[PDB]
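Q: Predict the assembly, please.
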Amino acid sequence: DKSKELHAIKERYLFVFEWDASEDTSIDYNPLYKERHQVQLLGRGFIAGIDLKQQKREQSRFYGDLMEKRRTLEEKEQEEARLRKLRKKEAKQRWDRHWSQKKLDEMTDRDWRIFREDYSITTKGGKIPNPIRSWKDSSLPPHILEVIDKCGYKEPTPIQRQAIPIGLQNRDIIGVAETGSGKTAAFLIPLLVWITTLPKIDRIEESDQGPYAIILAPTRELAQQIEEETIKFGKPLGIRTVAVIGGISREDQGFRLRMGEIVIATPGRLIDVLENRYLVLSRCTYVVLDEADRMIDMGFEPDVQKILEHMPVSNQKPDTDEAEDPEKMLANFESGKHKYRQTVMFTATMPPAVERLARSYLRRPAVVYIGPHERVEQKVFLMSESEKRKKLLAILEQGFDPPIIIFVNQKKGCDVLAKSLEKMGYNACTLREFALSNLKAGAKDILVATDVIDIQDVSMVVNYDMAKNIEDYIHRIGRTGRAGKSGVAITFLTKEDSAVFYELKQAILESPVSSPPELANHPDAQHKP
Amino acid sequence: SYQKLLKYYVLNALKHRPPKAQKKRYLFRSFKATKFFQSTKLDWVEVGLQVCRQGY
Amino acid sequence: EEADAIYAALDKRMDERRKERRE
Amino acid sequence: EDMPPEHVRKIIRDHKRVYLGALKYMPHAVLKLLENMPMPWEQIRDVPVLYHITGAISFVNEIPWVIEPVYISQWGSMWIMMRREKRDRFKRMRFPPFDDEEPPLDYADNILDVEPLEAIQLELDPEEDAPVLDWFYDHQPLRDSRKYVNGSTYQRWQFTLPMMSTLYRLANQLLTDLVDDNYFYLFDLKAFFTSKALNMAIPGGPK
Amino acid sequence: DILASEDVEGQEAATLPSEGGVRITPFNLQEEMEEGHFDADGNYFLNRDAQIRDSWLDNIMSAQALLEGLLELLLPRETVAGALRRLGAQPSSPQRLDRLSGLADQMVARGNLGVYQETRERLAMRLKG
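A: Predicted assembly structure:
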């Protein structure tokens, strides 16, 4: 300042799409001009566009004292009555809340559409029903709820949240999501509700008239996964599941075919069954094709068409709009045994052969669409070490979805960072099982930890200290989850991290869900360390 | 960004000169008297598709 | 022959706005 | 006079010196298309069209005239409604939707009988906004009224004073609270020209 | 001084342009002698005539039946465009308006210009003569 103003006296008397910081003006070391003392205009004028409540918070709070000193003794009551009228207008206005604090009977269609937008789901078709908000807010029968509670699914995946009401409204489903996001229970649960809610007079049959359900998978591994998950759903409900697959000797599968609801199969083995009469398709009303694009890429298409050719066509839906009307199809699902068939096809891409299978198999379907370094959003801030704590705080102050994880490199860091946050009024755990329960429960919101178990998907990972190698970094950001919401990993980079810049740069440049020239152009990110 | 936008505004204010007197200009009135052109009323999206496919 | 004469007449009419001042 | 839309629709649907000379004015038609894109609070807009006998080029032939305080009030209502929407609710649209191998969509089969969605409109409380309620979200507001607009060419306007009070109240978010020119002191055009002529920089001013 | 194509001792032909996305150099100095030239010491000098600079290229039924149909679709003393106006006034008759526009476009495409400002009697005289 003083040396600068002497410098001022001595100086007096003697493509790039961004703008550079050297083009800036008003870099003046004056006490009068940095604090320019903006006006508030009698406590009545407002700066346009900036939020009026925030402007009333950031005011000097001086003219309010001049008001309450110089108003008349009845005018304090007049001001209070005017503020009560304004709060009445605000309460009439707000009666636009968030869905986490609202009920089900008051949740309007705009709120359901924002709820569908929050979990990144979209639906094709007419009159899509309301999804499931929670298990206490769902509409399933209580015994199915008890079985799901015993299985361990605490929170529903969005593919469940959308495909279960559409599955209970007897509609054909095209689910576009990848394997590992919970598609299997998302088609099994309406099947289990339909089977366990039949009357006792409709379940009795003296002969074996085939399955109630055909679940076809292109590979033996996916067939065994859907097999094991269907068994662990079906054993508390007393529902038998038969696997018609390869790799198992023919005597065991043949002996299981003599016993006679759900059959999970592979296409070649299933067509060898159907062309040789080991199992019939009489009472079949439920067809699921998981990964039909993998069936096309391997070439099972005429085989699955010939599997269609064994189906009795007496339960096929008519090709009208009445296949997508929830009233008639809901009452048809309430009819029990004599309903039409329902087909659910899960896929990942759209070739024209899956479109031909959809035009051959489906009658006005509803398309439910869902959607580590390649698939986790990554952001970096270059700074000096001394800047880390204030940048973290600024980030936290923006608000987050708990729980989050903050990683540091040394265990002392872990403890001291954690203290500071609890000082700033944050609920912070350090890092056994006890910690994760609270986080899971909502008690603690921030986990501080070093590179050293098993933990839920997080919305945000912050690398307060950057990892010393890219493999540890990859493992960290992987904590936003295997799939579902991308989540965000924010990394503080300093000059001490230069030996990971090149690989960090690659990690991000290979991430289509990520946007960083500060690193990409940095002199230390240009060559392998 | 404020300073550069204010720079462009000061340049447009300084370089301003009054426009030269001329005959009043009507391209579409001379297009309308030609028998090769017709007039109608269309939606904005349909003519927006027609313009881009004619450009293609 | 007629259409080119019509578009040439319209070009001359668009040039009429500044014709006596420019040439 | 005008002509029904089905004829020019058939013109564009079924499809050389007369064809060659009309292709010169293509960016002018692009400009006339781009300067009349409809507002966010409008659902549909019907404009005149000049077109060639073979469908070589299609023009718009309309100047987007608006009344200035009505226009500022309408965009201020848009500002309020979009602040409301981001504080309440985001998914950005996926850019270019139509792929490189498929043609642009036919209007006669896909957009023609489909009713559009709900536009962006404020609630407009009928007690305070009563003089502005019947005309706030029209295409050209008050056009067929002889009290307010001079006629069909939509050139001159005059309003009443409670209407101007309402349009000034609704546009409060876009307007500053200034009352005099004791503001902008050494921050106006003459001081900026003086800083230009003397090759200096005002603090906060341009370089 | 300039070198010819004979003092190169070992040019060969151009078998394939690319494989696996990698462009293959054709092993001969023909394209280098087309773009530029050599001196006696083996330096290279390039031609520089690129005026436009091309900044994308740097980095890669019978007519009598038509007249009979139009005289069938017209009333006397009425223009063709006036018939379009009346039959377009959804319209009253979409199909006959579609037929009239199709016959008009088939007449325009044969070189007959300005068929919209044409009465029925002049088209009848055209069909007669």
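Chain B touches chain C through eight residues (CB under 8 Å). Strands of chain B lie at 37-43.
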